[PDB]
Scaffold this motif. Structure first.
Motif, PDB file in Angstrom:
ATOM      1  N   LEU A 185       1.073  -1.229   0.073  1.00 20.45           N
ATOM      2  CA  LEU A 185      -0.092  -0.057  -0.162  1.00 20.45           C
ATOM      3  C   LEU A 185       0.860   1.371   0.118  1.00 20.45           C
ATOM      4  CD1 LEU A 185      -2.522  -1.224   2.600  1.00 20.45           C
ATOM      5  CD2 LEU A 185      -2.635  -1.552   0.015  1.00 20.45           C
ATOM      6  N   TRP A 200       0.524   5.499   0.160  1.00 18.93           N
ATOM      7  CA  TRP A 200      -0.396   6.673   0.401  1.00 18.93           C
ATOM      8  C   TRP A 200      -0.193   7.763  -0.545  1.00 18.93           C
ATOM      9  CZ3 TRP A 200       0.973  11.764   2.319  1.00 18.93           C
ATOM     10  CH2 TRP A 200      -0.113  12.607   2.721  1.00 18.93           C
ATOM     11  N   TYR A 233      -7.506   3.193  -4.303  1.00 22.21           N
ATOM     12  CA  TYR A 233      -8.668   3.171  -2.985  1.00 22.21           C
ATOM     13  C   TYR A 233      -9.097   4.401  -2.705  1.00 22.21           C
ATOM     14  CZ  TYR A 233      -7.347  -1.991  -3.059  1.00 22.21           C
ATOM     15  OH  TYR A 233      -7.098  -3.180  -3.339  1.00 22.21           O
ATOM     16  N   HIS A 238      -4.729   7.214  14.432  1.00 21.83           N
ATOM     17  CA  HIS A 238      -5.346   7.310  13.177  1.00 21.83           C
ATOM     18  C   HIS A 238      -5.401   6.048  12.516  1.00 21.83           C
ATOM     19  CE1 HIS A 238      -4.805   7.785   8.697  1.00 21.83           C
ATOM     20  NE2 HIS A 238      -5.686   8.846   9.030  1.00 21.83           N
ATOM     21  N   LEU A 282      -7.631   4.256   8.768  1.00 27.54           N
ATOM     22  CA  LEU A 282      -8.653   4.322   7.647  1.00 27.54           C
ATOM     23  C   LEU A 282      -9.653   3.307   7.870  1.00 27.54           C
ATOM     24  CD1 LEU A 282      -5.661   4.827   5.447  1.00 27.54           C
ATOM     25  CD2 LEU A 282      -7.218   6.203   5.552  1.00 27.54           C
ATOM     26  N   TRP A 292     -13.282   1.859   3.267  1.00 28.32           N
ATOM     27  CA  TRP A 292     -12.633   1.809   2.017  1.00 28.32           C
ATOM     28  C   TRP A 292     -13.740   1.573   0.952  1.00 28.32           C
ATOM     29  CZ3 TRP A 292      -7.170   1.501   1.695  1.00 28.32           C
ATOM     30  CH2 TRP A 292      -6.260   1.461   2.997  1.00 28.32           C
ATOM     31  N   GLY A 293     -13.260   2.126  -0.286  1.00 26.68           N
ATOM     32  CA  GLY A 293     -13.920   1.821  -1.497  1.00 26.68           C
ATOM     33  C   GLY A 293     -13.553   0.845  -1.916  1.00 26.68           C
ATOM     34  N   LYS A 294     -14.390   0.266  -2.963  1.00 26.07           N
ATOM     35  CA  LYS A 294     -14.280  -1.144  -3.546  1.00 26.07           C
ATOM     36  C   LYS A 294     -12.466  -0.999  -4.309  1.00 26.07           C
ATOM     37  CE  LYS A 294     -18.596  -1.458  -2.920  1.00 26.07           C
ATOM     38  NZ  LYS A 294     -19.301  -0.157  -2.013  1.00 26.07           N
ATOM     39  N   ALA A 300      -1.717   1.567  13.206  1.00 32.10           N
ATOM     40  CA  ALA A 300      -2.729   0.878  12.921  1.00 32.10           C
ATOM     41  C   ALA A 300      -2.396  -0.165  12.027  1.00 32.10           C
ATOM     42  CB  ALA A 300      -3.675   1.735  12.145  1.00 32.10           C
ATOM     43  N   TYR A 302      -3.785  -3.301   9.281  1.00 32.40           N
ATOM     44  CA  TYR A 302      -4.848  -3.582   8.321  1.00 32.40           C
ATOM     45  C   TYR A 302      -4.388  -4.978   7.761  1.00 32.40           C
ATOM     46  CZ  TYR A 302      -5.585   1.569   8.255  1.00 32.40           C
ATOM     47  OH  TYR A 302      -5.770   2.512   8.608  1.00 32.40           O
ATOM     48  N   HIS A 318      -5.246  -7.271   4.384  1.00 31.84           N
ATOM     49  CA  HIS A 318      -5.450  -7.059   2.905  1.00 31.84           C
ATOM     50  C   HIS A 318      -5.548  -8.442   2.434  1.00 31.84           C
ATOM     51  CE1 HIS A 318      -5.765  -5.326  -0.874  1.00 31.84           C
ATOM     52  NE2 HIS A 318      -4.420  -5.609  -1.404  1.00 31.84           N
ATOM     53  N   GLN A 336      -9.875  -7.431  -2.771  1.00 29.65           N
ATOM     54  CA  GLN A 336     -10.502  -6.648  -1.931  1.00 29.65           C
ATOM     55  C   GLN A 336      -9.850  -5.700  -1.323  1.00 29.65           C
ATOM     56  OE1 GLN A 336     -12.172  -9.140   1.227  1.00 29.65           O
ATOM     57  NE2 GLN A 336     -11.268 -11.144   0.233  1.00 29.65           N
ATOM     58  N   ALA A 337     -10.668  -4.616  -0.785  1.00 25.23           N
ATOM     59  CA  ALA A 337      -9.951  -3.528  -0.005  1.00 25.23           C
ATOM     60  C   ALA A 337      -9.197  -3.938   1.077  1.00 25.23           C
ATOM     61  CB  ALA A 337     -10.973  -2.705   0.137  1.00 25.23           C
ATOM     62  N   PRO A 338      -8.373  -3.279   1.567  1.00 21.50           N
ATOM     63  CA  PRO A 338      -7.641  -3.467   2.907  1.00 21.50           C
ATOM     64  C   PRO A 338      -8.804  -3.286   4.000  1.00 21.50           C
ATOM     65  CG  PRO A 338      -6.313  -2.051   1.775  1.00 21.50           C
ATOM     66  CD  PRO A 338      -7.530  -2.368   0.812  1.00 21.50           C
ATOM     67  N   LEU A 345      -9.428  -2.694   8.230  1.00 17.04           N
ATOM     68  CA  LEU A 345      -8.898  -2.345   9.494  1.00 17.04           C
ATOM     69  C   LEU A 345      -9.002  -3.145  10.452  1.00 17.04           C
ATOM     70  CD1 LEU A 345      -7.626  -0.034  11.347  1.00 17.04           C
ATOM     71  CD2 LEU A 345      -9.916   0.692  11.584  1.00 17.04           C
ATOM     72  N   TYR A 349      -6.255  -0.191  15.931  1.00 19.99           N
ATOM     73  CA  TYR A 349      -5.830   1.239  15.852  1.00 19.99           C
ATOM     74  C   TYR A 349      -5.544   1.461  17.103  1.00 19.99           C
ATOM     75  CZ  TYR A 349     -10.310   2.385  17.891  1.00 19.99           C
ATOM     76  OH  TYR A 349     -11.498   2.586  18.708  1.00 19.99           O
ATOM     77  N   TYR A 370      -0.446  -4.977   7.246  1.00 25.11           N
ATOM     78  CA  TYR A 370       0.093  -3.604   7.170  1.00 25.11           C
ATOM     79  C   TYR A 370       0.185  -2.840   8.424  1.00 25.11           C
ATOM     80  CZ  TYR A 370       0.448  -4.495   2.194  1.00 25.11           C
ATOM     81  OH  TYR A 370       0.667  -5.021   0.786  1.00 25.11           O
ATOM     82  N   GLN A 375       0.535   0.992   9.750  1.00 23.90           N
ATOM     83  CA  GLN A 375       0.497   2.302   9.468  1.00 23.90           C
ATOM     84  C   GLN A 375       0.461   3.375  10.401  1.00 23.90           C
ATOM     85  OE1 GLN A 375      -3.382   3.870   9.527  1.00 23.90           O
ATOM     86  NE2 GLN A 375      -1.767   5.715   9.207  1.00 23.90           N
ATOM     87  N   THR A 377       1.047  10.390   5.786  1.00 21.99           N
ATOM     88  CA  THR A 377       0.589   8.941   6.007  1.00 21.99           C
ATOM     89  C   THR A 377       1.564   8.053   5.685  1.00 21.99           C
ATOM     90  OG1 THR A 377      -1.690   9.476   6.247  1.00 21.99           O
ATOM     91  CG2 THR A 377      -1.363   7.261   5.865  1.00 21.99           C
ATOM     92  N   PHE A 395       2.927   3.786   5.294  1.00 24.99           N
ATOM     93  CA  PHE A 395       2.527   1.901   5.516  1.00 24.99           C
ATOM     94  C   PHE A 395       4.087   1.473   5.763  1.00 24.99           C
ATOM     95  CE2 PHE A 395      -1.855   1.923   4.811  1.00 24.99           C
ATOM     96  CZ  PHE A 395      -2.019   2.989   3.842  1.00 24.99           C
ATOM     97  N   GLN A 419       5.877  -2.222   4.585  1.00 25.78           N
ATOM     98  CA  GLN A 419       6.076  -2.924   3.296  1.00 25.78           C
ATOM     99  C   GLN A 419       5.126  -4.093   3.433  1.00 25.78           C
ATOM    100  OE1 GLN A 419       8.414  -3.039   6.049  1.00 25.78           O
ATOM    101  NE2 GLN A 419       9.761  -4.600   5.988  1.00 25.78           N
TER     102      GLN A 419
END
Ligand SMILES: *[C@@H]1O[C@H](CO)[C@@H](O[C@@H]2O[C@H](CO)[C@@H](O[C@@H]3O[C@H](CO[C@H]4O[C@H](CO)[C@@H](O)[C@H](O)[C@@H]4O)[C@@H](O)[C@H](O[C@H]4O[C@H](CO)[C@@H](O)[C@H](O)[C@@H]4O[C@@H]4O[C@H](CO)[C@@H](O)[C@H](O)[C@H]4NC(C)=O)[C@@H]3O)[C@H](O)[C@H]2NC(C)=O)[C@H](O)[C@H]1NC(C)=O
Ligand SMILES: *[C@@H]1O[C@H](CO)[C@@H](O[C@@H]2O[C@H](CO)[C@@H](O)[C@H](O)[C@H]2NC(C)=O)[C@H](O)[C@H]1NC(C)=O
Ligand SMILES: *[C@@H]1O[C@H](CO)[C@@H](O)[C@H](O)[C@H]1NC(C)=O
Lengths: 106, 229, 123, 186, 229, 186, 229, 184, 123, 106, 123, 106
Positions: free
Chosen positions: I45, I47, I94, I109, I111, I114-116, J34, J36, J38, J42-44, J46, J49, J87, J89, J96, J98, J100
């Motif tokens: 990922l 940013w 994303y 902090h 996230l 999340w979007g698709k 935080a 995540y 993945h 599909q999206a990561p 959470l 946190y 990940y 973060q 922001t 992340f 690796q």
């Protein structure tokens, strides 16, 4: 702008005599004048400042006076090592002006 | 009460009613039995002088060395020297306050004092009369007093100077007696530069009074120079 | 003991740039007007200009358009720079220390400590 | 507004100027009578100076003092400490050629036997020197008078706080009744 | 007076003068006839607490919700939320006050409070430390508190904040005990934004005192940034 | 300057805090004696608050109130209402670690029989809490003593405003003459 | 004290204690011998009216001629005329204060009064509403009052005008009764121009009160227009 | 701060309004007891006006007066002379529709026999006119009462400064002892 | 219940402008950092950047010269504009809702929504 | 700039075994990290946190810990639906970052 | 007795610059609106514009782009300058003194003293 | 902009008759109208201002009235020297406007 006229342009006096030099300002001075001695080969030497005070190492025979527009330098009994060119010098705020110079010769 | 009355007999004998009361008391007692500066003789005039120097840690102290040299000391390390002089030391027209603030190198207390002085000047309207140098965190401020005397830069600057160094300020001041409260001197410049601490107060004792009084003068007599201040 | 050490090439060609420097050894650098004077052959002393430790300057107007005087307080020196020199700039150039007293009447000013002087011929 | 700073504890309820606070070397303590005037007067320079010195002492004691002055502190406290219009009164007197107080020197009357003192009054200057005593001896004499009168008055006020007027009225009535009765006997 | 004396007897019995007078009166009369907290017994210590909320229509009321959130409410509809936070919400260097005034969309009372706050800060000299957004008539003001602590933007801002929300603001403060009166917090930003009315005063009562006291601080300690104000 | 606001008419000359002005819901009236102190004292927090509340009441009553605050009105009236140097006194006490007034809470003494009260005094705070009553019981006792003494002294002052000193002089001298006469008889 | 009591007899009979004392004194003496508006009868209600004009040499004096015309005189020679009017005399948007200061031709007292007036206006935030002409040392200032009424430049300008011309100011004012302290008039402009002295005070006496009171209002309610004042 | 200006010497310790100071064009002198109130009151309009007039007088006398006013002088002396919050009090009363002082006119009581007077109080205005006397008559009555009481109290106070309390106690005890003796 | 509906063409030629948008459905738009993240194949990922409702932004410095992010509070949407696309911009993109808590320690902090995601290939 | 390094790069563990994943900052963190999850396609998602708080719907199996520079994510008894990429973060003001990422495989 | 003396040439070519002046003899120059009016042949009166002693001005918008009005207070005169004249600018031109009363309702304004009038033709 | 329309466009009347001329303003007037009489060969003459006041030297037969949007000028018993063109005139702030004018003929 204050200018200085030195009189006379030349003096002829024998050693051991009395010497008088005049500096006339074009207007009442912002600051009492200084007198420098200048012999060929070396730097001008401060002699008198405040028109009457004697700088360090200046023999007591040197004296000065004056005010307003008329200032005068006097050597009471002049020695052969006092023959040089003498300058009166004025300063207003950030402006320094010299007289044209009076030359003392035997 | 009664003993205290006995202790103050000289001050109360002179009254007629006090005498009458004493006589009545004495008669009643008898009949009951039958059945270098001195004032008022006791008050010595004594004096004290305050050591304002002890305040140095919490407020500025002003004093006068001579006709031309005056000081405001801040603590035991730093201060400002105010000189009335015919010899200017700045020959330009800049006063780069904004750049001085951006760099933030000066002494904050000294900048506060300079600000209070300048903001206390009544009717200052000639920005070219004030020149400055703040490079390297130094403070050097030159007011040009060259010339009715009442409506001049020199008058306003001198009024503020007199208050800021109140006590010993007068010996260079009021030489040209002006109309109303107006001041005039023979000096062409007032110069304010930062300096290190030294006992300069030959002419007048150190005092916080002038500065403290000037605090309420700040902005009281400024002009508007724009519509949105 | 105060001395003024002068440096800079005195032999130049017309329209060149006269560049002289003077280093101060002794006493303070602040509170004095560091001054450049010159004497042309056969003539009297002529004030070129002066500068402070604050870089405030005053110039002789007749030379004003060509003269720049600068300072370096870190090594206590001051420099003269005269551009587009012609035969009229042949002279002996002195660096001097000036002191002005304006705190009480009578005011006075003097140049007490002088440099040796640099012979400057432009041809 | 109006000054509000209350003096620290010291003469039980008075105030003492220590030896550092004075030019000569001796402690000088003032009683509660003089110091209470400082709580309410608006034109006493010495009271303003007492508040200044006390604030200096308390700030140094209670705050971690450093060699660098925080001009902000005095700048925000001054009007709680002093009346700046008193400084202005002396400035206005000065420019009018009237004798004025420059806040250095003060005079007071000290009773030879009992050591009670008046509240110190500023010793005025004019043309660069302090006044001679004879120029303000009238003020001095008035001060002397004040002391005595106030002292006497204070005793009365204290009595009034302890003995009710009802009791004075009862004693007066009883005495008058007894006098009328002894007249009846005669 | 007689009845008053009769009802105040115990406090005056202790005085020997009062006993003497009573005995004398009694003797004269006889001879004439022959021919939960309590104080001094009678005083109960009672307390009251003021409802400052009733002042809401004519003056602002400040209070503290918690260490980070404080409020100054104007009336029953609007106010300013002051948040000490490490999360900044403005990431630019502008504060477009002139355009905000020209557009004239903001609440005038809220702009007044913002002005009083900013003018009350002692020795503010880093204009880049203040960022703003007034678009649409909103009020959003962000002070950067990031870095002696006395001569810093953070200290001056925090002193003004301590006064503005006096009462409840100390719990955010006094964390780093500074020299003299100087304050230090672990927070990086102080943010002021307009909000709607809500009862936020969990930690301290609403109070006009801080604001009213801050009115007299305006301009007392600003610096000059130009010769003609 | 100095505050000038005069309290509205209410304890014929006193002042009443209504039910809404107090956190507890009941009326509280203070008599003319305590409230008269507010006319001349400069360091009483409760008097500043009474002036603030009275100004709020009178402004709401006499002006046409709108939901939008005109901050101009209070901004220009504040110094007529209060001494901002009293706020400064409490701020300076706060930063120096001294107990200070946060203007919420006040204490007063109430005579169990006659219902007469002293002027309320601020209940100070320290470390985020109200001081225990044992910390300022000395001030409480001082107020009780002051209540007694000031009552007796008011009684005296009222008599002095009604009975001329000359009448007392005449009564005393007539009694003395009568005593001299009865001695002549005996 | 006896003669004073004999003189002040009439106000002491009503007290019973005095009657008892007088009767007792009389009995004691006898036994010793045997062995246009009037108040309280004597206090006449008298009045005086101060001639404020005699203060002319040391302070400005304001007075109202009629609804539209008002004046602040400074000495016996100059002053300012303040007119509420529908007829504007300036139709540009300039107010060239800096150039006027640079030229230094105006009367300094009149510039001071202009500054005090302008700095006393609460929440002034439309620089376009103030126009000026200072050419040749004259003073001409035009406030455009054209338009909630409380948050308008017209309201702030009129509040200042009411204070500065206090006494006689009401006849032009409060025509539209506003919320809180807010004023509305039917005039579109307030114009301030310098004028020569003349006895204008037909409606209200000259008085310094408004000016002196307005001195403490200066800067109290100005908005911030930039970060570094 | 607080006003500090002390009135100049004039009624030995009082103060006089000269003919020029008044519209009535007559001298009006006020006694020491009324005037001394001005030293310590904060809400008396007349005392502020007295200080203003006295400052004007002294400034013209001791300074070189010129036709051009120095607005600086009054700008810096005003708070030493008057309470600007008293001006504010009257301004707030005016805008609230409450009768207020506009500083022109004052009323005082004057004893027909002795010539002693109370401190002048402002004659209030409302709706463009001075109030009728009958509107504020109670105040006038109060003032009259005050003068009487104050005068009486003054006597007591001065007696208390000349006769010590202990002499009163000694006289009282001597009389009581004598009465006890004559009973025997 | 919060959804982030994403839109925009993922098929592009090199040097063209990628233009993606994300609409927020649910809860407030204020108080969040609307964030663009990307994952290029074979990497983790990354940013891209973020924006507030005040249009204050933060960008990854490796893309700052080419990335613009914007908001439209009227329709509760935020947009990414990337210019001069090369093969390095092939990724899944994303949009996510970030929340920052800085009112007390420990600050945090995340996230959370999340979007698709959109497949953005350039060739 | 505060950067994150995740250890190990790959982690091979049997289902039902405990898994510990470390994230090392380069400085003391501006905010707690935080974590995540993945999964490809599909999206990561959470997970954690504030280094210790579980997000919505995250089973109590996932836990976190850490402070300063060292942070850890723990899975007590991992299920087959836990094998994915993880990940850490971090965020400083308007930045922001992340890690690796760590691949957790059977 | 107030007189308005008009002056200036009325015979002009197209695109020339009409330049008229009016001098005021009598009463004050300040407090009036010195006004230029014109009447084209077979038409009514048209306000060209007006100017104050402060040189503040108002212009007819149909002429605003091409008209200027000025004052010389030292000689109590005011001038009109119309550039690039065309056939539509043929008219009689009058200078007039205007007075506005705006101190009390009803406000009024009038033109009480008029100049003689200059015939101006262009062809 | 405030505009003025006069009525009738032309008026035919005999000497000694009552003459009424009207002026309608588009909106409520900023100031009450003025009326001028214009004869060929000479400058317009101010008749009425403030809608009802007579200019100096204007005979008593000339009168006016009106408010808001409607104003009127009246000649009671007109003389042969009253036959001319007439203009109403309005001024808002820095903007002066004239009516088109009503012709008055025998
Ligand atoms: C506080 O509040 C009070 C109460 O509201 C207020 O009092 C008002 O004060 C004003 C101002 O002084 C008073 O107006 C004065 O009235 C006088 C009387 O006017 C009536 O009588 C005359 C005939 O005598 C009539 O013509 C007139 O119509 C009225 O019925 C009058 O004397 C005053 O006017 C003269 O004085 C002023 C000031 O100097 C001057 O400017 C005027 O021109 C006039 O002087 C003389 O004018 C004539 C004619 O032009 C001329 O020939 C002559 O040479 C002039 N000089 C002399 C020496 O005669 C003035 O208008 C008003 O009555 C008071 N109101 C009430 C209700 O009592 C205070 O002013 C307020 N205080 C403050 C500070 O605001
Ligand atoms: C307003 O002030 C200006 C200048 O301050 C005055 O104009 C000056 O007036 C004096 C006095 O007669 C003349 O000597 C000058 O020549 C004038 N200067 C100019 C016109 O630049 C002006 O008269 C004042 N206005 C009023 C109405 O009094
Ligand atoms: C003035 O201030 C500067 C800046 O700190 C300092 O370095 C310098 O030495 C000071 N000068 C004097 C004379 O104290």
């Amino acid at each position: 702008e204050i200018v200085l006229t030195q009189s006379p342009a030349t003096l002829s006096l024998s050693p051991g005599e009395r010497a008088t030099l005049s500096c006339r300002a074009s207007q009442s001075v912002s600051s009492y004048l200084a007198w420098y001695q200048h012999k060929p080969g070396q730097a001008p030497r401060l002699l008198i400042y405040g028109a009457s005070k004697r700088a360090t190492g200046i023999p007591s025979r040197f004296s000065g006076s004056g005010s307003g527009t008329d200032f005068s330098l006097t050597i009471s009994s002049l020695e052969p090592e006092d023959f040089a060119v003498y300058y009166c010098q004025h300063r207003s705020d950030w402006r320094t002006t010299f007289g044209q110079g009076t030359r003392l010769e035997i | 009460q009664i003993v205290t009355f006995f202790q103050e007999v000289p001050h109360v004998i002179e009254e007629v009613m006090n005498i009458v009361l004493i006589a009545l008391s004495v008669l009643a007692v008898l009949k009951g039995l039958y059945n270098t500066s001195l004032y008022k003789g006791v008050y010595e005039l004594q004096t004290l002088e305050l050591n304002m120097e002890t305040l140095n840690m919490t407020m500025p102290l002003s004093c006068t060395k001579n006709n031309s040299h005056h000081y405001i000391m801040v603590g035991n390390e730093t201060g400002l020297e105010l000189t009335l002089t015919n010899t200017s030391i700045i020959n330009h027209k800049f006063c780069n306050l904004s750049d001085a603030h951006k760099k933030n190198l000066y002494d904050h207390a000294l900048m506060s004092i300079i600000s209070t002085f300048h903001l206390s000047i009544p009717n200052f309207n000639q920005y070219e009369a004030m020149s400055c140098d703040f490079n390297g965190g130094k403070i050097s401020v030159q007011y040009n007093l060259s010339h009715n005397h009442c409506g001049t830069v020199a008058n306003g600057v001198l009024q503020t100077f007199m208050r800021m160094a109140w006590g010993g300020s007068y010996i260079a001041l009021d030489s040209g007696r002006g109309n109303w409260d107006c001041i005039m001197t023979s000096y062409q410049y007032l110069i304010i530069q930062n300096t290190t601490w030294e006992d300069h107060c030959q002419f007048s004792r150190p005092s916080p009074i002038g500065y403290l009084g000037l605090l309420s003068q700040r902005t009281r007599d400024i002009y508007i120079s724009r519509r949105l201040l | 003991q105060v001395q003024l050490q002068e440096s800079g090439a005195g032999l130049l060609k017309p329209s060149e740039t006269l560049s002289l420097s003077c280093t101060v050894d002794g006493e303070s650098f602040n509170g004095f007007f560091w001054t450049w004077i010159r004497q042309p052959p056969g003539k009297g002393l002529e004030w070129i200009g002066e500068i402070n430790h604050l870089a405030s300057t005053g110039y002789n107007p007749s030379l004003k358009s060509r003269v720049t005087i600068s300072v370096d307080t870190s090594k206590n020196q001051f420099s003269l720079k005269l551009t587009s020199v012609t035969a009229a700039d042949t002279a002996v150039y002195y660096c001097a220390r000036g002191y002005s007293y304006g705190f009480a009447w009578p005011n006075y000013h003097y140049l007490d400590v002088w440099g040796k002087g640099t012979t400057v011929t432009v041809s | 507004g109006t000054f509000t700073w209350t003096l620290s504890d010291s003469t039980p309820g008075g105030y003492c100027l220590t030896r550092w606070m004075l030019i000569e070397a001796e402690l000088k303590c003032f009683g509660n009578t003089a110091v209470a005037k400082c709580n309410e007067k608006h034109d006493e320079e010495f009271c303003d100076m007492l508040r200044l010195f006390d604030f200096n002492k308390q700030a140094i004691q209670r705050l971690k003092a450093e060699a660098q002055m925080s001009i902000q502190l005095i700048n925000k406290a001054v009007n709680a400490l002093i009346n700046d219009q008193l400084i202005m009164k002396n400035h206005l007197r000065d420019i009018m050629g009237i004798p004025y107080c420059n806040y250095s020197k003060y005079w007071y009357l000290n009773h030879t036997t009992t050591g009670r003192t008046s509240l110190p009054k500023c010793w005025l200057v004019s043309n660069g020197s302090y006044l001679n005593e004879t120029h303000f001896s009238d003020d001095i004499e008035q001060q002397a008078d004040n002391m005595i009168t106030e002292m006497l008055q204070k005793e009365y006020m204290e009595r009034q706080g302890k003995t009710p007027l009802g009791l004075v009225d009862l004693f007066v009535f009883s005495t008058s009744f007894y006098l009328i009765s002894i007249f009846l006997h005669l």
